[PDB]
């Protein structure tokens, strides 16, 4: 929830704390059994650095456990600007492209394919790059190569959960964020029997990928603008998958690969399976 003031009257760094409430923590003033209100199943308290210790001990002494603590300054920050992604840009590799035009596509691809994530010179793939610019490989085929490349697996698929990897994949291959639980399910099943390669293939193969930036167009963020057969909640999910510019999908950070989209949110949009 929005936190109104970053620092307290006496200087301190306010911190939001979220806890699963317990009947002892809060209880109605009613006869019968003590019950914490339902709406506050998750309860957010804002406390100065000083009281934090004592506030949390008490929460944990009771049946409460701490869902997460975030600094109030990071919290109560705007939703990320959608400036750049509102209209993506678009990169088209013409046949008989000039040396510079090929370079632009490569740089654009690496951006969207691997997220903000930086690719070192050593990491970068000469062979694949070589083929584009002589002809022989579509931009689409270059895309395939990159997903198949270990670089991608090490980052996205090998560190995080396959539940993580699917949306991570959706975003990279399609602007879109995942809509519905079903898509996540389907992909996992495909992975079990077919293996990595077939799952990777399915996204590029899929008609949605063909309908927008089908061939020789580097993928751009379709999400953050209205799309056919896209649940409204997906739009909100995009904001969770995409944090800012200069914000990347990083295996490097502490507990690096986690879920941007909470599973319940997916279930909201669609259930059936």
């Amino acid at each position: 929830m929005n936190v109104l003031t970053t620092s307290s009257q006496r200087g301190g760094k306010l911190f939001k704390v979220t806890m699963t409430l317990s009947p002892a923590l809060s209880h109605h003033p009613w006869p019968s059994l003590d019950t914490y209100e339902p709406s506050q199943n998750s309860y957010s308290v804002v406390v100065p650095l000083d009281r934090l210790l004592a506030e949390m001990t008490y929460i944990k002494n009771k049946g409460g456990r701490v869902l997460d603590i975030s600094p109030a300054d990071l919290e109560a920050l705007g939703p990320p600007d959608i400036s750049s992604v509102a209209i993506p840009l678009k990169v088209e590799l013409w046949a008989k492209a000039d040396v510079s035009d090929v370079q632009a596509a490569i740089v654009a691809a690496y951006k969207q394919i691997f997220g903000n994530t930086y690719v070192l010179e050593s990491e970068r793939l000469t062979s694949a790059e070589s083929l584009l610019r002589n002809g022989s490989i579509s931009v689409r085929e270059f895309v395939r190569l990159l997903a198949k490349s270990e670089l991608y697996k090490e980052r996205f698929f090998f560190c995080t959960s396959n539940n993580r990897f699917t949306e991570l994949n959706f975003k990279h291959f399609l602007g879109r964020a995942p809509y519905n639980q079903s898509e996540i399910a389907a992909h996992l099943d495909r992975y079990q029997t077919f293996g990595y390669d077939a799952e990777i293939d399915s996204y590029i193969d899929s008609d949605e990928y063909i309908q927008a930036f089908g061939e020789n167009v580097v993928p751009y963020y379709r999400g953050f603008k209205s799309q056919s057969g896209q649940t409204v909640e997906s739009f909100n999910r995009m904001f969770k998958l995409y944090r800012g510019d200069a914000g990347s999908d990083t295996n490097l950070n502490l507990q690096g690969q986690k879920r941007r989209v909470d599973p319940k949110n997916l279930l909201r949009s669609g259930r059936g399976i």
Partner: protein, 46 residues
């Protein structure tokens, strides 16, 4: 089956004891709890 009941002596009743102390309903307390959805009035009363 006499069902002798009778007024009895002391005849203190429920009310008299507290009126003697003079609590006049300070000792009995009805708690007031806020709700996430509340009328401004309900906030006022709080």
């Amino acid at each position: 089956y006499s069902a002798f009941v009778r007024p009895a002596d002391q005849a203190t009743a429920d009310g008299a004891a507290q009126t003697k102390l003079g609590i006049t309903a300070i000792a009995p307390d009805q708690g007031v709890e806020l709700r996430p959805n509340f009328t401004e009035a309900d906030v006022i009363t709080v």
